[model samples]
Target: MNVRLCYASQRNEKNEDLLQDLRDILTEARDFNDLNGICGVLYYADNAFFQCLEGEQEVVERLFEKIQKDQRHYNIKWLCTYSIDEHSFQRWSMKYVQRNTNIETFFLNMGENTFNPLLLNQQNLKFFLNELLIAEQTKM
Candidate 1:
């Protein structure tokens, strides 16, 4: 089954700035995930992260276990995962997006007084991911 896994985590405070950490993570993530037949997007704001991993059920699950043990991030909050009949995209890749005024407005629209990745529900997360994906497509 094709499964999509979502989770949120916080950057370890002792680490360097978010952009530096982001660069390192995406460098590893894109290569590793591409080889593993996975597809996902990483979102960052306020030192918090929200990501979605889409791939075969077992593969995604195994990766999550590895992610959990990684010391660079803490307080990993498991969001939601579900099986789909088909994959969303054919090729495996990782997309990265950072916070912007438009994203902050999204949270505000949801009645959230502040932007907090952990507090987002499954419904909200799904919508947010869709929005990000759409915005990503315009780059070309």
Candidate 2:
């Protein structure tokens, strides 16, 4: 089972400045020296993340626990969770992506007027992930 999580958070007073902080952490995770294993894609806009972390069950759980303790966001919402037949990628410590899709509807349904991490329900999350994977296969 892949212990996965999709989360969202609010920016306090300085939405613009928060990216620097996030960039720092993302840079570290992109090249984390310790434990050195975990992989995912993260999309950030409006000071929030739409991310999925996957790996061995224990490693994924540990990553989520560490994220909760990171002191990076004022609020966090676990949007959804599900198990997949297998990981989409075989090798990457952590892959942070600036989302490639223009999912306007997903953003609107999330109930945020700004560019928030679209709060996808379980079904939609699976649908989107599948769509992305299929697209990835085509590109490769």
Candidate 3:
């Protein structure tokens, strides 16, 4: 079965070094995409992060288990999760998105208002996947 996980995390402290360290972790994670076929979008700010990851069940589970050990942030929480019959991102190794705030804002810019992964529909997913592809390409 495929898996979808949406989680939020907050830092225990707000030191500049820690913030910088988190960015460094993210930088490494971008490259770490080679480790698994997982992909998701994330928003990080105010010492908090909201994210959604979709992939194979074992892969998502294993990756998140490893995330706790990641030096990027503190206090990870699993907000929501569900099972699906097939992978949403079976092609890419990983697709990471650093999203702008507010669903309304996202819609205004991308012409869609919904951002919930639990009830995901393809039209919006195409927008998201396309955005992720462009963003990933820009990274390389």
Which candidate has the top score in TM-score? Answer: 1
lDDT of 1 by residue, 1-140 (tens): 88989898988988867667777778888888889999878777777888889999998999999989977789999989999676654343777777777778888999876687677787887778776665443110
Count of backbone clashes, every candidate in sequence: 0, 0, 0
Off by over 4 Å in 3: 85-140
Instruction: Give the per-residue Cα lDDT of candidate 3 at 49.
Output: 61
Which 10-residue window of candidate 3 scores lowest in summed lDDT? 131-140
Per-residue lDDT tens digits for candidate 3, residues 1-140, read: 77777666765565567656655655665566557666665555446665667877787788788877765567787766788665554444444345444443545565544444323345654454444444532132
Summing lDDT over every window of 10 consecutive residues in candidate 1, give the lowest-scoring window.
131-140
Candidate 3 yields a Cα-based lDDT of 0.58
**Model 2 segments beyond 4 Å from truth?**
12-16, 33-35, 89-91, 99-101, 105-118, 130-140
lDDT of 1: 0.79
Per-prediction TM-score: 0.88, 0.68, 0.58
* Residue ranges of candidate 1 with Cα displaced over 4 Å: 89-92, 137-140
Top model by lDDT, which number? 1
State the RMSD for candidate 2.
4.8
lDDT of 2 by residue, 1-140 (tens): 66555566655545456757767766777675235556665555555666677666766667777777766666767776556577664344454544445444444555534544454556667655544433332110
